[PDB]
């Protein structure tokens, strides 16, 4: 089997993409926020306090004739971010671009954090890291990918995320018309329960690529690049009267500056960030000043090649006994 669906960024920066999922008999469309970076399925849903529900879509599981308790069951996440969220757990059919899965925990929200209730467009998530990260307790359920992963023609996943544009999530196949050139491959550390990898450095814009050990993660679910604050520093000294901003939380600079692509390597290969995808518009409405796209990961423990990166690429996640990802230029 294979499933494929169009992934749709939720506003006009590309915060986050939304990919519409069926849940329950007779379905439930949800747009859920596809998330490399965890391993719950969960949804705002009939039981989430009503105070904290804001134009979501929700999840009702007594509508659906395959829904069915998880005795005992519970969640409770916390994301990079400060967001969380907590509930109970059904199972239920759910179904992507196709591909269907029966008997998948999704998990109900009761509680939702702020940044959640003002998000109207995203009406939960979908981890699809490694189901070693999955909170539910006291049984850890599976991720969707790991549910379906037999039954796909081939034990992969592919996230091929559009710049101001929609994209594509598949399941089971690689669309080798989606990319240019080919595919590099690179492994993966399962350790931390992440799709975690090994850049093998960067450049930015015309300048020499730097072969560095880049440590980090491939997270579909973080905007930003978010690199060590060596890089950060040399990608935005290029760029006239850029800043690190504590008050704003980051780089900051004027929405007048052309800004500097920035490269990262796979293997071998090479990724081309256009300098485009780098803005962020201004930090408040009607500012000059600009949020950058690549920010500093010093205090949050680790690199995270979220959407600014990945949106430059055709990526592979490779679910085989021993996982691997890949990288094309597209």
Same mark, same amino acid.
């Given at each position: 089997?294979?499933?494929?669906?169009?992934?749709?960024?939720?506003?006009?920066?590309?915060?986050?993409?939304?990919?519409? @999922?069926?849940?329950?008999?007779?379905?439930?469309?949800?747009?859920?926020?596809?998330?490399?970076?965890?391993?719950?399925?969960? *949804?705002?849903?009939?039981?989430?306090?009503?105070?904290? @529900?804001?134009?979501?879509?929700?999840?009702?599981?007594?509508?659906?004739? !395959?829904?069915? =308790?998880?005795?005992?069951?519970?969640?409770?996440?916390?994301?990079?971010?400060?967001?969380?969220?907590?509930?109970?757990?059904?199972?239920?059919?759910?179904?992507?671009?196709?591909?269907? *899965?029966?008997?998948?925990?999704?998990?109900?929200?009761?509680?939702?954090?702020?940044?959640?209730?003002?998000?109207?467009?995203?009406?939960?998530?979908?981890?699809?890291?490694?189901?070693?990260?999955? !909170?539910?307790?006291?049984?850890?359920?599976?991720?969707?990918?790991?549910?379906? %992963?037999?039954?796909?023609?081939?034990?992969?996943?592919?996230?091929?995320?559009?710049?101001?544009?929609?994209?594509?999530? $598949?399941?089971?196949?690689?669309? &080798?018309?989606?990319?240019?050139?080919?595919?590099?491959?690179?492994?993966?550390?399962?350790?931390?329960?992440?799709?975690?990898?090994?850049?093998?450095?960067?450049?930015?814009?015309?300048? !020499?690529?730097?072969?560095?050990?880049?440590?980090?993660?491939?997270?579909?679910?973080?905007?930003? =690049?978010?690199?060590?604050?060596?890089?950060?520093?040399?990608?935005?000294?290029?760029?006239?009267?850029? %800043?690190?901003?504590?008050? @704003?939380?980051?780089? *900051?600079?004027? +929405?007048?500056?052309?800004?500097?692509?920035?490269?990262?390597? *796979?293997?071998?290969?090479?990724?081309?960030?256009?300098?485009?995808?780098?803005?962020?518009?201004?930090?408040? &409405?009607?500012?000059?000043? +600009?949020?950058?796209?690549?920010?500093?990961?010093?205090?949050?423990?680790? $690199?995270?090649?979220?959407?600014?990166? =990945?949106?430059?690429?055709?990526? @592979?996640? $490779?679910?085989? &006994?021993?996982?691997?990802?890949?990288?094309?230029?597209?």
């Amino acid at each position: 089997s294979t499933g494929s669906a169009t992934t749709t960024p939720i506003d006009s920066l590309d915060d986050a993409y939304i990919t519409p @999922v069926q849940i329950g008999t007779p379905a439930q469309t949800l747009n859920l926020d596809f998330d490399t970076g965890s391993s719950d399925l969960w *949804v705002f849903s009939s039981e989430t306090t009503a105070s904290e @529900v804001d134009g979501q879509t929700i999840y009702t599981p007594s509508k659906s004739t !395959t829904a069915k =308790l998880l005795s005992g069951a519970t969640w409770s996440i916390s994301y990079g971010d400060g967001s969380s969220s907590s509930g109970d757990v059904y199972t239920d059919t759910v179904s992507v671009g196709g591909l269907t *899965v029966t008997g998948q925990a999704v998990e109900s929200a009761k509680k939702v954090s702020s940044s959640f209730t003002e998000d109207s467009t995203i009406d939960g998530l979908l981890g699809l890291a490694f189901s070693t990260l999955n !909170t539910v307790s006291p049984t850890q359920q599976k991720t969707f990918f790991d549910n379906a %992963k037999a039954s796909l023609d081939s034990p992969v996943f592919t996230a091929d995320l559009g710049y101001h544009a929609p994209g594509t999530y $598949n399941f089971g196949f690689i669309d &080798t018309t989606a990319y240019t050139g080919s595919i590099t491959y690179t492994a993966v550390s399962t350790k931390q329960g992440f799709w975690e990898w090994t850049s093998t450095g960067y450049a930015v814009g015309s300048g !020499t690529f730097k072969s560095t050990s880049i440590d980090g993660i491939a997270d579909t679910g973080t905007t930003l =690049l978010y690199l060590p604050a060596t890089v950060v520093s040399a990608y935005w000294a290029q760029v006239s009267g850029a %800043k690190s901003s504590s008050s @704003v939380g980051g780089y *900051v600079f004027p +929405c007048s500056a052309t800004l500097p692509s920035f490269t990262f390597g *796979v293997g071998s290969a090479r990724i081309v960030i256009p300098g485009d995808y780098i803005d962020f518009g201004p930090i408040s &409405t009607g500012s000059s000043s +600009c949020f950058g796209g690549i920010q500093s990961s010093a205090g949050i423990g680790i $690199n995270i090649f979220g959407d600014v990166a =990945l949106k430059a690429a055709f990526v @592979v996640f $490779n679910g085989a &006994t021993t996982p691997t990802l890949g990288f094309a230029s597209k």
